[PDB]
């Protein structure tokens, strides 16, 4: 069968027809090793990002792009490129950048190189339309095709697949699939994990979440640092706690 012709015939996206779309010990180890959830309301444009210490092993960056508000403060790639992300990243560290599906696939790569990373993976969030086969798409003027996926770029400085398949969320829902956290945490990259532009709804053990729409804060730099003082400085986040 030709699923592309089918999508032309019926409006069902080809991804609708993908099927099936001891790692529990790793998960349980992740949970034991996880720091308490920490979170801070901060307007990131006006916030000295250097006030977030210590240097992070993982950074998940989820800037609110205009393209997320089809039928609905947006950050442009101009603004995102000016973030001083290399000032808070550990010399060996990882970034995960949600780039959307348009110009972000290019400007996101400029960002990664500007902040000193090289891209090692391209994780695509592929959206099914099983529940609204009819609903079409207001196409970007430059678009050639209907856009039905988003990319999260993984960068490095110094078990899982690169695909996430879920149903397209309701219009105006900007949440990214929580599966990205599982992918990230299964890499065992260290325990200082920062989520920039997270929300009340994404707060999660093992993560420091910083963003303008958080309603509460509990961040304390010295309290936060204390979770990684010796003997715990170099833990991967996938090993037992030190007695």
């Amino acid at each position: 069968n030709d699923y592309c012709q089918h999508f032309v015939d019926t409006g069902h996206r080809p991804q609708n027809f993908i099927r099936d779309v001891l790692i529990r010990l790793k998960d349980e180890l992740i949970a034991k090793s996880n720091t308490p959830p920490m979170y801070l309301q901060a307007d990131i444009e006006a916030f000295d990002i250097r006030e977030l210490t210590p240097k992070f092993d993982v950074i998940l960056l989820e800037p609110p792009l205009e393209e997320y508000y089809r039928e609905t403060k947006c950050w442009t790639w101009d603004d995102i490129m000016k973030l001083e992300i290399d000032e808070i990243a550990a010399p060996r560290s990882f970034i995960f950048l949600w780039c959307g599906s348009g110009e972000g696939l290019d400007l996101g790569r400029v960002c990664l190189r500007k902040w000193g990373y090289r891209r090692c993976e391209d994780i695509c969030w592929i959206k099914t339309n099983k529940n609204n086969p009819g609903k079409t798409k207001t196409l970007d003027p430059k678009a050639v095709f209907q856009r039905t996926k988003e990319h999260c770029l993984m960068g490095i400085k110094g078990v899982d697949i690169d695909l996430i398949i879920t149903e397209e969320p309701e219009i105006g829902n900007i949440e990214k699939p929580v599966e990205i956290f599982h992918i990230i945490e299964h890499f065992c990259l260290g325990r200082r994990r920062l989520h920039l532009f997270g929300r009340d709804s994404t707060i999660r053990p093992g993560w420091l979440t910083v963003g303008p729409t958080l309603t509460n804060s509990n961040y304390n730099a010295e309290t936060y640092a204390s979770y990684f003082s010796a003997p715990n400085s170099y833990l991967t986040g996938c090993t037992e706690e030190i007695e």
């Binding site: 030709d2 090692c120 430059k142 678009a143 095709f145 856009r147 690169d162 890499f187």
Partner: protein, 199 residues
């Protein structure tokens, strides 16, 4: 001339200015590091700019060529306006460095002001079975035909399984030279009176 056409050549040395202009270009290059590769400088130096005035480029990339392909695309004068992924499945529609790879990427570039194309008919995700290793899925041809039906198209670094109506296929494992379009046949004899395409 609608039926399949092809030229066995070292794409490095063919004078593509004999081929005319094309509504769509597709390339699946042998990026550097079994078959012959091209260095990054050779890739950059390809004369892609003479192949189109207004139209689309489809450029398969992998690994580090994701970045290098974006460079060539921009150097050749295109803007990247879409990115197609092919989700690789088996015959039961199940998905086949730091992660396992379930997809391949095809950059989509635009040059000039293309008019009369049927943009938005297909979506940017292909779901298809890995028929033969290193082969691109045949679905890409249908997508390109729906987008620009009836127009002239050219494929760079193709193989005999790739020849299609409305396409001219270039590659070094093709069977001789098979041209049917009279404008092309004329310019080829002029440029190559003894049928030899030399450096």
């Amino acid at each position: 001339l609608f039926p399949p056409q092809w030229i066995c050549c070292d794409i490095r040395y063919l004078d593509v200015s004999i081929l005319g202009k094309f509504a769509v270009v597709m390339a699946d290059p042998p990026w550097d590091i079994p078959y012959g590769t091209l260095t990054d400088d050779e890739m950059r130096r390809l004369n892609i700019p003479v192949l189109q005035d207004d139209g689309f480029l489809f450029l398969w990339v992998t690994g580090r060529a994701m970045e290098l392909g974006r460079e060539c695309l921009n150097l050749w004068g295109y803007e990247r306006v879409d990115e197609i992924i092919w989700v690789k499945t088996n015959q039961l529609q199940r998905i086949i460095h730091w992660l396992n790879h379930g997809k391949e990427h095809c950059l989509v570039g635009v040059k000039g002001n293309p008019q009369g194309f049927n943009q938005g008919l297909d979506c940017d995700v292909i779901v298809a079975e890995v028929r033969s290793t290193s082969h691109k899925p045949d679905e890409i041809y249908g997508m390109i035909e729906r987008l620009s039906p009836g127009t002239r198209k050219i494929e760079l670094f193709g193989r005999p399984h790739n020849v299609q109506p409305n396409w001219i296929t270039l590659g070094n494992q093709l069977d001789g030279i098979h041209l049917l379009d009279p404008d092309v046949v004329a310019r080829f004899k002029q440029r190559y009176p003894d049928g030899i395409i030399s450096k």
